[PDB]
Ligand binder design. Structure first.
Ligand SMILES: Cc1ccc2c(c1)sc(-c1ccc(N(C)C)cc1)[n+]2C
Ligand SMILES: Cc1ccc2c(c1)sc(-c1ccc(N(C)C)cc1)[n+]2C
Ligand SMILES: Cc1ccc2c(c1)sc(-c1ccc(N(C)C)cc1)[n+]2C
Ligand SMILES: Cc1ccc2c(c1)sc(-c1ccc(N(C)C)cc1)[n+]2C
Ligand SMILES: Cc1ccc2c(c1)sc(-c1ccc(N(C)C)cc1)[n+]2C
Ligand SMILES: Cc1ccc2c(c1)sc(-c1ccc(N(C)C)cc1)[n+]2C
Ligand SMILES: Cc1ccc2c(c1)sc(-c1ccc(N(C)C)cc1)[n+]2C
Ligand SMILES: Cc1ccc2c(c1)sc(-c1ccc(N(C)C)cc1)[n+]2C
Ligand SMILES: Cc1ccc2c(c1)sc(-c1ccc(N(C)C)cc1)[n+]2C
Ligand SMILES: Cc1ccc2c(c1)sc(-c1ccc(N(C)C)cc1)[n+]2C
Ligand SMILES: Cc1ccc2c(c1)sc(-c1ccc(N(C)C)cc1)[n+]2C
Ligand SMILES: Cc1ccc2c(c1)sc(-c1ccc(N(C)C)cc1)[n+]2C
Lengths: 55, 55, 55, 55, 55, 55, 55, 55, 55, 55
C-alpha cells in the first residue's frame, strides 16, 4: 500500500476508536465528576483535558 | 509499503485506540473525580492532562 | 518497507494503543481522584500530567 | 527496510503501547489519588508527571 | 536496514511499550498515591517524575 | 439538660447536617455516576448505599 | 446533664454531621463512579456501602 | 454527668462527624471509583465497605 | 461522671470522628480506586473493608 | 468516675477518632488503590481489611 499525508491524518484498519483533533476539544470517554463546593478566584477545580494559552 | 508524512500522522493496522492531537485537548479515557471542597486563589485542584502557557 | 517523516509521527503495526500529541493534552487512561479538602493559594493538589510555562 | 526521520518519531512493529509527545502532557496510565487535606501556599501535593518552567 | 534520525527518535521492533517525549510530561505507568495531610509553604509532598526550572 | 429516648433519636445543637433513618433509604449527598455499558444477569454495577435481604 | 437511651441514639453538641440508621441505607457523602463496561453474572462492580443477607 | 444506654448509642460533645448504624449501610465519605472493564462470574471488583452473609 | 452501657456504645468528648456499627458497613473515609481490567471467577479485586460469612 | 460495660464499648475523652465495630466492616481511613489487570480464579488482589469465614 501507499500513503502520503500532510497532517494531521489518522489512518488505520480494524480499529475500535479514532480521534483526530486540531483545535479545540474532543471528549469521547467516560467521565464522572462529583463535587460539593468550589470557591476561590480562580481555581481550576477538576480539569481532565485542558489547555490555557491566554495572551 | 510506502509512507511519507509531514506530521502529525498516526498510521497503523489492527489498532484498538488512536488519538491525534494538535492543540488542544482530547479526553478518551475513563475518569472519576470525587471532591468535597475547593478553596484558595488559585489552586489547580485535580488536573489530569493539563497545559498552561499564559503570556 | 520505506518511511520518511518530518515529525511528529507514530507508525506501527498490530498496536493496541496510540497517542500523538503536539500541544496540549491527551488523557486516555484510567484515573480516579478522591479528595476531601483543598486550600491554599495556590497549591497544585493532584496533578497527573502537567505542564506550566507561564511567562 | 529504510527510515529517515526529523523527530520526533516513534516507529515500531507488534507494539502494545505508543506515546509521542511534544508539549504538553499525555496521560495513558492507571492512576489513583486518594487525599484528605491539602493546605499551604503553595505546595505541589501529589504530582506524577510534572514540568514547571515559569519565567 | 538503514536509519538516519535527527532526534528524538525511538525505533524498534516487537516492542511492548514506547514513550517519546520532548517537553513536557508523559504518564503511562501504574501509580497510587494515598495521602492524609499536606501542609507547609511550599513542600513537594509526593513527586514521581518532576522537573522544576523556574527563572 | 435532660433527655430520654427510645430510639432512634438524633439530638444535637449547632449542627450542619442530620439524617435519621429506619427503613429504607436516604440520599442527601452529592453523587455522580457515569456509565457506558451494563450487561450480565444480574450484576450490581454501581451501588453506593445498598442493602439486600431477599428471603 | 443526664441521658438514658434505648438505642439507637446519636446525641451531641456543636456537630457538623450526623447519621442515624437502622435498616437500610444512608448516603450523605460525595461519590463519583465512572465506568465503561460491566459484564458477568453476577459481579458486584463498584460497591461503596453494601450489605447482602440473602436467605 | 450521667448516662445509661442499651446500645447502640453514640454520645459526644464538640464532634465533627457521627455515624450510628445497625443494618445496613452508611456512606458519608468521599469516594471515587474509576473503572474500565469488569468481567467474570462473579467477582467483587471494587468493594469499600462490604458484608456478605448469604445463607 | 457515671456510665453504664450494654454495648455497643461509643461515649466521648471533644471528638472529631465517631462510628458505631453493628452489621453491616460504614464508609466515612476518603477512598480512590482506579482500575483497568477485572477478570476471573471469582476474584475479589480491590477490597478495603470486607467480611464474607457465606453458609 | 465509674463505668461498667458489657462490651463492646469505647469510652474516652479528648479523642480525635473512634470506631466501634461488631460485624461487619468500617472504613474510615485514606485508601488509594491503582490497578491494571486482575485475573485468576480466584485471587484476592488487594485486600486491606478482610475476613473470610466461609462454611
Ligand atoms: C499560535 C499557533 C499555535 C499552534 C500552531 C500554529 C500557531 S501553526 C501550527 C501547525 C499546524 C499544522 C502543521 N502541519 C500540518 C505541518 C504545522 C504547524 N500549530 C500547531
Ligand atoms: C490561530 C490559529 C490556530 C490554529 C491554527 C491556525 C491558526 S492555522 C492551523 C492549520 C490548520 C491546518 C493545517 N494543515 C491542514 C496543513 C495547517 C495549519 N491551525 C491548527
Ligand atoms: C507558538 C507555537 C507553539 C507550538 C508550535 C509552534 C508555535 S509551531 C509548531 C510546529 C508544529 C508542527 C511541526 N511539524 C509538523 C514539523 C513543526 C512545528 N508547534 C508545535
Ligand atoms: C486560570 C488560572 C489562574 C491562576 C493560576 C492557574 C490558572 S494555575 C496557577 C499556578 C500553578 C502552579 C503554581 N506553582 C507550582 C507555584 C502557581 C500558580 N495559577 C496562579
Ligand atoms: C495516507 C497515508 C497512507 C499510508 C501511509 C502514509 C500516509 S505515511 C506511511 C508510512 C510512513 C513511514 C513509514 N516508515 C518510515 C517505514 C512507513 C509508512 N504510510 C504507510
Ligand atoms: C515556543 C515553541 C515551543 C515549542 C516548539 C517551538 C516553539 S517550535 C517546535 C518544533 C516542533 C516540531 C519540530 N519538528 C517536527 C522538526 C521542530 C520544532 N516546538 C516543539
Ligand atoms: C426483620 C427486621 C429487621 C430489622 C428490625 C426488626 C425486624 S425489629 C428492629 C428494631 C427496631 C427498633 C428497635 N428499638 C427502637 C429498640 C428494636 C428493634 N429492627 C431494626
Ligand atoms: C434478623 C435481624 C437482624 C438484625 C437485628 C435483629 C434481627 S434484632 C436487632 C436489634 C435491634 C435493636 C436492638 N436494641 C436497640 C437493643 C437490639 C437488637 N437487630 C440489629
Ligand atoms: C442474626 C443476627 C445478626 C446480628 C445480631 C442479631 C441477630 S441480634 C444482635 C444484637 C444487637 C444489639 C444488641 N445489644 C444492643 C445488646 C445485642 C445483640 N445482632 C448484632
Ligand atoms: C451477588 C454475588 C453473586 C456471587 C458472588 C458474590 C456476589 S461474591 C462471590 C465470591 C466471593 C469470593 C470468592 N472467593 C474468595 C473464592 C468466591 C465467590 N460470589 C460467587
Ligand atoms: C439521651 C442521653 C443523654 C445523655 C447520655 C445518655 C443518653 S447515655 C450517657 C452516658 C453513658 C455512659 C457514661 N459513662 C460510662 C461515663 C456517660 C454518659 N449520657 C451522658
Ligand atoms: C449469628 C450472630 C452473629 C453475631 C452476633 C450474634 C449472632 S449475637 C451478637 C451480640 C451482639 C451484642 C452483644 N452485646 C451488646 C453484649 C452480644 C452479642 N453478635 C455480635
Amino acid at each position: 500500500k501507499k500513503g502520503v499525508v500532510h497532517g494531521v491524518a489518522t489512518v488505520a484498519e480494524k480499529t475500535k476508536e479514532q480521534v483526530t483533533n486540531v483545535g479545540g476539544a474532543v471528549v469521547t470517554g467516560v467521565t464522572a465528576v462529583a463535587q460539593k463546593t468550589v470557591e476561590g478566584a480562580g481555581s481550576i477545580a477538576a480539569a481532565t483535558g485542558f489547555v490555557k494559552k491566554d495572551q
